[PDB]
């Protein structure tokens, strides 16, 4: 539905921009203001995650040795497994997307840039299928933006 489209748009845009360093110039779809704020939030908060945990993220990438649209399936099982302790929070969600960006960058450097598309799809599926009820209860991307808002 709309939550799926909005999520895939936000996550795809973030991962592609992280991999290429190019901001997409085209307009967002419905609920564009929330999506633009979600992207601002991912840029800002995802930077803190990736820099605080860069060494660990590097080691994770080495472990997985992702080089094919199929190692991404292994990553999907890992990402679902994150939530198997029954704990959900916005920190875990931003962290998964941040690790996704770290992987997207690696995929570009090894010349598999089109795999950023199935990568974005797999991360989106964890939020909008696996954790749909929590996402909706927490107000979706508006809740995400509010959780990470910068105080005056």
């Amino acid at each position: 539905d709309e939550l799926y489209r909005q999520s895939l748009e936000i996550i795809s845009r973030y991962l592609r921009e992280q991999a290429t360093g190019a901001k997409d110039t085209k307009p967002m779809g419905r609920s564009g203001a929330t999506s633009r704020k979600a992207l601002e939030t991912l840029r800002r908060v995802g930077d803190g995650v990736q820099r605080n945990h860069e060494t660990a993220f590097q080691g994770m990438l080495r472990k997985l040795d992702i080089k094919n649209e199929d190692d991404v399936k292994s990553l999907s099982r890992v990402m679902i497994h994150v939530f198997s302790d029954g704990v959900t929070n916005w920190g875990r969600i931003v962290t998964l997307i941040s690790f996704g960006a770290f992987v997207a960058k690696h995929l570009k450097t090894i010349n598999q840039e089109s795999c950023i598309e199935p990568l974005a799809e797999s991360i989106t599926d964890v939020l909008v299928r696996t954790k749909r009820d929590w996402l909706v209860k927490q107000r979706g991307w508006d809740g995400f933006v509010e959780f990470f808002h910068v105080e005056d």
């Binding site: 908060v45 994150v82 962290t95």
Partner: peptide, 13 residues
């Protein structure tokens, strides 16, 4: 263990 590391970082965040 990747999932444990991702969980930890998400709970701190």
């Amino acid at each position: 263990a990747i999932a444990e590391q991702l969980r930890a970082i998400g709970d701190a965040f």
